[PDB]
Nucleic acid binder design. Structure first.
Lengths: 104, 138, 133, 175, 36
RNA sequence: CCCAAAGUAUACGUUAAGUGGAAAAGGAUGUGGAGUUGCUUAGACAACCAGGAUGUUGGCUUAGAAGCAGCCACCAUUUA
């Protein structure tokens, strides 16, 4: 679950890449991949990016990235709930180990 | 699932269904109802099916009044046996429904919700049905 | 022609003005300075600017008034509206700045009289969740 | 309130016959039409306008009055202006071809497609895709267009085969 | 589909009576119904 | 009507399937009637020529909801 908690921060970069692709998806739609992207945010002007996309649709790849991001934030809710439940279960099971170990 | 938990006799004659409804002819609890047009025995399984079919589509709304009750039992002789040698064991319960009788009563919803719920109930029943409403002369 | 509401203080980068002028066939960065020159005195607000298109790749932009929504945010102070207007009355705006907001919309709106305009911006104020008082 | 009462103006120059047992021949610059009708209807012709009158209010007469007036309108429209049904052959290897009066279609079958036009109906192939059939009767050009569409029906995944003017085929997603 | 309960599925469905048979035609070809 | 004796009888309607001359739940713009109700020659239901709008990308919302994901009091003008 902590692996998915790191996949949460990984998914945000994918969402940003999808937004960059969306603000530039008006040319090279046919077989679109490794297309240089001009920085849309910040004054950094960071090196042109080269996103690679599958052959679905130039917009549905960015839309798929944005969907992965929504699933990621729902995961941020649910996996934290599951971690809380799992530590409660580990505390109860360690207590049950203690009560079984010293029992007649 | 409706059945009496105690009966005076477990085996009864099947009776006759001549004439109109003796009572329960006018809608007087809910706003809308089903009026029977033909006479047949209505099994409590059919009553349960109609009640679930109304209640599911009326997930928000008023309660359902079931005006009929399966008080009369029917006996079913076991299969592959000869005729006679005693009356068979009772199997289920039916309600004797005459034409003109109100079957189920609905109040507290809209018009089209009630009409569609009564249509879904009527498609489970073995009798011809019609839509009736309360009349206020009065 | 493609019309759009361009923010004054964030017209430099590749968002909104980027892909709109990119499909027209002109360099965005050569006109971002021209946008920021005329949007300096109304900075901090989102200004709709008409983007006319010509065959000889020359572009002249006809700016418009600020919207009645943004001007009511200036008059009230809150940036984001309520979740349910006419259910959570978050702000109240006096009628004098309402008259000023209606008087700012003379050269674009086709209203014959200012009373019609203040009756319009009363209706826009009701969509804001802001009490007209 | 119905099509049997509106006037039908005819252009210059056409003429119409009023032969017995309801047979109508229509003369004009672009052909000749002749059809047989039903004896129950009385037809009358005025100055440069045609009128059809009902005998009664029965449903058969109410249908037949409208059909007769509509097909007379079709005759006077086709004898002076004509009717064109345009078709497009969409594809990388699709071609309509001409060899005299014969019409050849380079549909992707293993055998060349040939269709024989009837008399009075002509087909012209100007370009890569677009093809025009010419005629003076709507029924004949409709039958010709149906016969052209019959050899290759358009398949819904991609635009292929014979297609009219503006009409949407249902797009389906493949894998 | 051939069924004895020919009904309009959607709002675009139109009920017709070709050849003495109750039919429904629609822009969606899945809604085409015939009886008899 | 003929086989097969006697009306191709009279008046008023109905049915178009060979119903007549084999059954149902259910489905259906079949048709003949009866009775309400909105409009209608100040011009009715459809059809053809035009407007189909600016305040305004109405707000909350996701990058983006620009009338047309969702929640929504749902207003005001130029006016034919």
């Amino acid at each position: 679950l902590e692996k998915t908690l790191e996949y949460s921060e990984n998914a945000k970069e994918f969402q940003l890449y999808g937004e960059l692709l969306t603000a530039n998806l008006y040319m090279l739609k046919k077989g679109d991949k490794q297309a240089e992207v001009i920085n849309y945010y910040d004054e950094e002007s960071p090196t042109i990016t080269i996103p690679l996309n599958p052959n679905k649709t130039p917009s549905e790849n960015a839309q798929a990235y944005f969907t992965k991001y929504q699933k990621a934030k729902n995961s941020v809710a649910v996996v934290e709930e599951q971690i809380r439940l799992a530590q409660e279960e580990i505390e109860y099971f360690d207590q049950l180990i203690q009560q079984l170990s010293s029992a007649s | 699932m409706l059945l009496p938990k105690r009966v005076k006799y477990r085996r009864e004659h099947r009776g006759k269904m001549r004439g109109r409804a003796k009572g329960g002819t006018e809608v007087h609890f809910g706003e809308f109802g089903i009026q029977a047009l033909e006479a047949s025995w209505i099994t409590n399984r059919q009553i349960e099916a109609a009640r679930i079919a109304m209640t599911r589509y009326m997930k928000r709304g008023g309660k359902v009044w079931i005006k009929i009750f399966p008080s009369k039992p029917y006996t079913a002789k076991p299969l592959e046996v000869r005729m006679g040698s005693g009356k068979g064991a009772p199997e289920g319960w039916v309600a004797v429904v005459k034409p003109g009788k109100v079957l189920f009563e609905i109040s507290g919803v809209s018009e089209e919700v009630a009409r569609e719920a009564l249509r879904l109930a009527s498609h489970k029943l073995p009798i011809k049905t019609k839509f009736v409403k309360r009349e206020e002369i009065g | 022609v493609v019309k759009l509401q361009i923010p004054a203080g964030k017209a430099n980068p590749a968002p909104p003005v980027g892909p709109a002028l990119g499909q027209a066939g002109v360099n965005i960065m050569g006109f971002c300075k021209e946008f920021n020159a005329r949007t300096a005195d109304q900075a901090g607000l989102i200004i709709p600017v008409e983007i006319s298109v010509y065959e000889d790749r020359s572009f002249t932009f006809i700016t418009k008034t600020p919207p009645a929504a943004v001007l009511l945010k200036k008059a009230a102070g809150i940036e984001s509206g309520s979740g349910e207007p006419n259910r959570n009355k978050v702000a109240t705006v006096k009628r004098d700045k309402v008259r000023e907001i209606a008087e700012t919309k003379m050269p674009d709106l086709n209203a014959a009289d200012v009373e019609a305009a203040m009756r319009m911006v009363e209706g826009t104020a009701r969509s804001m969740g802001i009490v007209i008082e | 309130s119905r099509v049997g009462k509106k006037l039908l103006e005819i252009p210059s120059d056409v003429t119409v016959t009023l032969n017995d047992n309801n047979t109508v021949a229509v003369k004009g610059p672009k052909g000749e039409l002749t059809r047989t009708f039903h004896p129950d209807m009385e037809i009358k012709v005025e100055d440069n306008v045609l009128t059809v009158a009902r005998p009664s209010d029965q449903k058969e007469h109410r249908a037949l009055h409208g059909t007769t007036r509509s097909l007379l309108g079709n005759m006077v429209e086709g004898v002076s202006k004509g009717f064109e049904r345009g078709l497009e052959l969409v594809g990388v290897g699709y071609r309509a071809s001409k060899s005299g009066n014969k019409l050849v279609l380079n549909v992707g079958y293993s055998h060349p497609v040939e269709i024989v036009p009837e008399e009075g109906i002509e087909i012209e192939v100007p370009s890569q895709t677009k093809v025009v059939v010419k005629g003076t009767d709507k029924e004949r050009v409709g039958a010709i267009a149906a016969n052209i569409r019959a050899v290759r029906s358009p398949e819904p995944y991609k635009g292929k085969g014979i297609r009219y003017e503006g009409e949407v085929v249902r797009r389906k997603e493949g894998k | 589909k051939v069924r004895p309960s020919v009904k309009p599925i959607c709002e675009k469905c139109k009920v017709i009576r070709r050849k003495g048979k109750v039919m429904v035609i629609c822009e969606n070809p899945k809604h085409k119904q015939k009886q008899g």
